[model samples]
Target: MKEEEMKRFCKAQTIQRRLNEIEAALRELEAEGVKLELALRRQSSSPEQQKKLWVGQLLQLADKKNSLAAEEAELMITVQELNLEEKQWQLDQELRGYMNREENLKTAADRQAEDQVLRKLVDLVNQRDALIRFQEERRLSELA
Candidate 1:
């Protein structure tokens, strides 16, 4: 019971931390996008604008588009991970509750089979973790 409680707490903390990081980056990107929008509009409104300035702003718009796409993908990935986490947690709780029941007459073999299924789910979760980690690594490498 204690361990499960701690597990929940730790999981929530980690998830919260991950969410906050994403939100912060999202905010930063949004700020950049907004500024770019205003700058572009300002330039468009000006009757006399330098071609170089217009060209530079256009380039920035492309860069912003790419960054937004990347961030959008990451957001979706994060949601998928959270969904997996929630589903796995539910399955784990159900399995544990079933196994702990004294009145239940499930065979040991059945329990073992279910345990194997849980292991498979764990593997899938880890697979997702690898993808997210890889994505993060790429982001870091790009930043560096």
Candidate 2:
């Protein structure tokens, strides 16, 4: 390569190396900014509350933070209990489905009683038919 072209290439290489260094520093600062934001977020109730502390109502800040934390804990437990009650109600409907089938609707002894009654009814019908036949025979013989 000619010296003139080599000098131009070297200049480009130096500029690219400088840009890389700046990019690395920018990336490091961005990660540090994220950590600071999360730390700021945890220190108070809301952005409004943060304004009080950051804007210099630093008086009794720990006391306020503690009370707010307790209140949050209480409300979270109440929400869990409400969701649990709804779950139990739905679970009961699902659990009772098997009992409504036709085969299981009656007891074994009750079915046996129905069969016994049907047999007795058939026997009574047969006895009534035999009596009618005996009466007809008597009438025929008497007429002869």
User: What are the TM-scores, per candidate, against the unseen true structure?
Assistant: 0.50, 0.30
Residue-level lDDT of model 1, residues 1-144, one tens digit each, is 657656766766676676677667767766776776676667775644564565576577568667766766666666666566666676677667666756467788777867876786687678778877988898899899
Model 1 segments more than 4 A misplaced: 1-50, 140-144
How many residue pairs clash per model? 0, 0
User: Lowest summed-lDDT stretch of 10 residues in model 2?
Assistant: 90-99
Relative to the true structure, candidate 1 has a C-alpha RMSD (angstroms) of 6.9
What is the C-alpha lDDT profile of model 2 across 1-144, one tens digit per residue? 246445545655665565566556556555655555665667665676655554343334445545555554444444443344334433444334423446657578756655555555555555555655765786798689
Which candidate comes out best when scored by lDDT?
Answer: 1
Give residue 115's lDDT in candidate 2 (0 to 100): 58
User: Predicted candidate 2: what Cα RMSD to the true structure?
Assistant: 38.9
Q: Could you report the Cα RMSD, in angstroms, for every candidate shown?
A: 6.9, 38.9
Which residue runs does candidate 2 get wrong by more than 4 Å? Answer: 1-56, 103-144
lDDT of each: 0.69, 0.52
